[PDB]
Amino acid sequence: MQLTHQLDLFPECRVTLLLFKDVKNAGDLRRKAMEGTIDGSLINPTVIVDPFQILVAANKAVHLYKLGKMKTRTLSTEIIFNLSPNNNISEALKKFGISANDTSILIVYIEEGEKQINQEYLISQVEGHQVSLKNLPEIMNITEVKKIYKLSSQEESIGTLLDAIICRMSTK
Amino acid sequence: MQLTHQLDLFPECRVTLLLFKDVKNAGDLRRKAMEGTIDGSLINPTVIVDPFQILVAANKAVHLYKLGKMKTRTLSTEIIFNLSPNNNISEALKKFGISANDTSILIVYIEEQINQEYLISQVEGHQVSLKNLPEIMNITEVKKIYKLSSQEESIGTLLDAIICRMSTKDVL
Numbered sequence: 299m300q301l302t303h304q305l306d307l308f309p310e311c312r313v314t315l316l317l318f319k320d321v322k323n324a325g326d327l328r329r330k331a332m333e334g335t336i337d338g339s340l341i342n343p344t345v346i347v348d349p350f351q352i353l354v355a356a357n358k359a360v361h362l363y364k365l366g367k368m369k370t371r372t373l374s375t376e377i378i379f380n381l382s383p384n385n386n387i388s389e390a391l392k393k394f395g396i397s398a399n400d401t402s403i404l405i406v407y408i409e410e411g412e413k414q415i416n417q418e419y420l421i422s423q424v425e426g427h428q429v430s431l432k433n434l435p436e437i438m439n440i441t442e443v444k445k446i447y448k449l450s451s452q453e454e455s456i457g458t459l460l461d462a463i464i465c466r467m468s469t470k
Numbered sequence: 471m472q473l474t475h476q477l478d479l480f481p482e483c484r485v486t487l488l489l490f491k492d493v494k495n496a497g498d499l500r501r502k503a504m505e506g507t508i509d510g511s512l513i514n515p516t517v518i519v520d521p522f523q524i525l526v527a528a529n530k531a532v533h534l535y536k537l538g539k540m541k542t543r544t545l546s547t548e549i550i551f552n553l554s555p556n557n558n559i560s561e562a563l564k565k566f567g568i569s570a571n572d573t574s575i576l577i578v579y580i581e582e583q584i585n586q587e588y589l590i591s592q593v594e595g596h597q598v599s600l601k602n603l604p605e606i607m608n609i610t611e612v613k614k615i616y617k618l619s620s621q622e623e624s625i626g627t628l629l630d631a632i633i634c635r636m637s638t639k640d641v642l
Contacts, residue, residue, distance in 0.1 A: 305642075307539060353642065354641055357642060361533065361537075364537060365479065365533060365536060365537070367479040367480075461634070461638045464637065465633075465634040465637050468637040469633060469634075469637065
């Protein structure tokens with residue numbers, strides 16, 4: 299059900315994605331994310347075409363973190379911001395973070411060294427139903443994605459799609 | 471003249487671009503580059519549509535250099551490698567680096583402090599301004615290497631497509 303990925307550039311870093319459906323407490327999760335009583339980055343899964351898009355965002359996040367050149371104040375926000383087409387942080391977090399009105403949530407987190415996330419506890423904090431990440435394509439909304447990244451109606455493979463999105467995430 | 475820029479996340483670093491036309495000793499400047507008796511990345515100017523292209527490649531290289539994560543042996547090679555959309559190192563230096571029978575050369579170098587009027591005296595040719603780059607740049611070559619639509623678009627538009635080609639390379 300979890301998706302786990304060892305960063306090839308930063309081997310000691312592993313990134314985990316967890317997906318939840320039927321979420322009855324998005325309102326509180328958002329507050330916990332905003333007073334930091336919750337691990338990970340809470341990401342609106344409606345606008346994430348493939349976990350691959352999150353892995354690029356996280357890879358860049360870790361990179362600026364290791365350089366000490368994050369554009370945002372923390373690793374968790376930096377992941378979310380990297381998803382955005384543009385330089386507004388306060389708009390980026392609004393659009394790609396969760397809102398109280400989401401019923402589906404994607405959480406993303408990174409571990410290296412001694413710092414290990416209590417996954418079992420994180421899961422228990424979501425009043426929802428954890429689903430496999432293979433479920434993303436039906437929770438995902440292709441019109442929103444295309445709107446947000448200013449993309450062409452002309453349908454394409456997730457691969458072509460991903461390169462267009464990755465490009466809009468690099469140039470902002 | 472010369473053009474110079476601050477690096478994105480390291481304002482204490484400068485990229486300098488020097489353009490040269492009517493170069494006689496390209497063959498030797500290439501031998502010396504290797505050897506390391508000349509500073510900088512020696513670059514094919516016929517495939518550069520805008521300095522910005524160089525800036526992206528230099529940023530990207532320095533951000534790996536500062537961690538010792540470069541794909542190539544050295545910073546000068548890394549910059550040239552970053553210009554190519556493909557992974558093969560040796561193929562990227564061949565298209566983007568200089569060859570024995572070139573008569574135009576672009577030198578690119580970073581400081582955090584290289585002189586310069588000796589560097590100029592390395593090149594057995596005339597130093598012209600960078601505004602001069604559009605008139606050497608082989609447009610049908612650019613299209614073949616970056617694989618762009620044939621149908622004629624703006625330098626601005628072509629540049630974006632070029633920035634995307636570089637931006638989708640190795641991402642993970």
